[PDB]
Design a protein around this ligand. Structure first.
Ligand SMILES: Nc1ncnc2c1ncn2[C@@H]1O[C@H](COP(=O)(O)OP(=O)(O)OP(=O)(O)OP(=O)(O)OP(=O)(O)OC[C@H]2O[C@@H](n3cnc4c(N)ncnc43)[C@H](O)[C@@H]2O)[C@@H](O)[C@H]1O
Ligand code: NA
Length: 214
């Protein structure tokens, strides 16, 4: 099974990706996690993304296309994979089509703009896994600690209100057009397309997604 998740910043994609990976046994390919890991380790491929991400802007198409082509060439992707944050522009989507990469489901998370800031300013993350929490809406079992490993959670440097506002403007200009792109692909028989109400509680969104995916 191959899946793409679409939606605005803070819509809940990373939260739901963890449940899909577990139930269907496929790896997640998260371009944001890969870029943040490259910055932390100083990797030649991606470490220069630091200043762009902290400004709330998208990194270049060529850099993230190379990161994804390297990741999915690997062996855990022979049974499928889940794309979370890629594609982010029409040229990234066209690059996947031209490479012959087709998917089975495109899942859109619908969330009103007015909810995004307060979701992101309360976000706390376990950087080694990509797992995510919220101090008010979805907290860990022990404050400040990852549920699965118990290790200390951190706050992302780009998760302040003014950066989030810039990311949303960028989303509307560059990324929202992918809803139409994959709606058109689904009408041609090339994938299934479905939308979920991302304002429901975490456990209900999970249940709605399981009904779609079977
Ligand atoms: N392909 C690409 N091309 C170019 N540049 C790229 C790129 N990919 C990455 N980049 C670069 O990386 C930067 C950051 O990108 P990115 O890493 O993708 O971060 P983002 O834009 O800020 O938004 P997310 O996708 O991380 O949010 P989400 O939909 O996953 O929701 P979440 O589960 O976290 O949940 C949000 C919060 O709400 C909480 N929450 C989740 N679900 C619910 C719920 N149902 N009810 C209440 N609260 C909830 C969560 O606990 C959490 O605290 C970009 O600006 C760009 O520079
Ligand atoms: Na397909």
């Amino acid at each position: 099974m191959r899946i793409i998740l679409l939606g605005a910043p803070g819509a809940g994609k990373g939260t739901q990706a963890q449940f899909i990976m577990e139930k269907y046994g496929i790896p997640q390919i998260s371009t944001g996690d890969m870029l943040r890991a490259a910055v932390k380790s100083g990797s030649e491929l991606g470490a220069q993304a630091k200043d762009i991400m902290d400004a709330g802007k998208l990194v270049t198409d060529e850099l993230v296309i190379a990161l994804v082509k390297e990741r999915i060439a690997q062996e855990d992707c022979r049974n499928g994979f889940l794309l979370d944050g890629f594609p982010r522009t029409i040229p990234q989507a066209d690059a996947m089509k031209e490479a012959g990469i087709n998917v089975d489901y495109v899942l859109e998370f619908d969330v009103p703009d007015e909810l995004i800031v307060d979701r992101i300013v309360g976000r706390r993350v376990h950087a080694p896994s990509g797992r995510v929490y919220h101090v008010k809406f979805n907290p860990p079992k022990v404050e400040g600690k990852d549920d699965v490993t118990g290790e200390e959670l951190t706050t992302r440097k780009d998760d302040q209100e003014e950066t989030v506002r810039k990311r949303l403007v960028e989303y509307h200009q560059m990324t929202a057009p992918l809803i139409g792109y994959y709606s058109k692909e689904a009408e041609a028989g090339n994938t299934k397309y479905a939308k979920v109400d991302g304002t429901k509680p975490v456990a209900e969104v999970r249940a709605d997604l399981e009904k779609i995916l079977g």
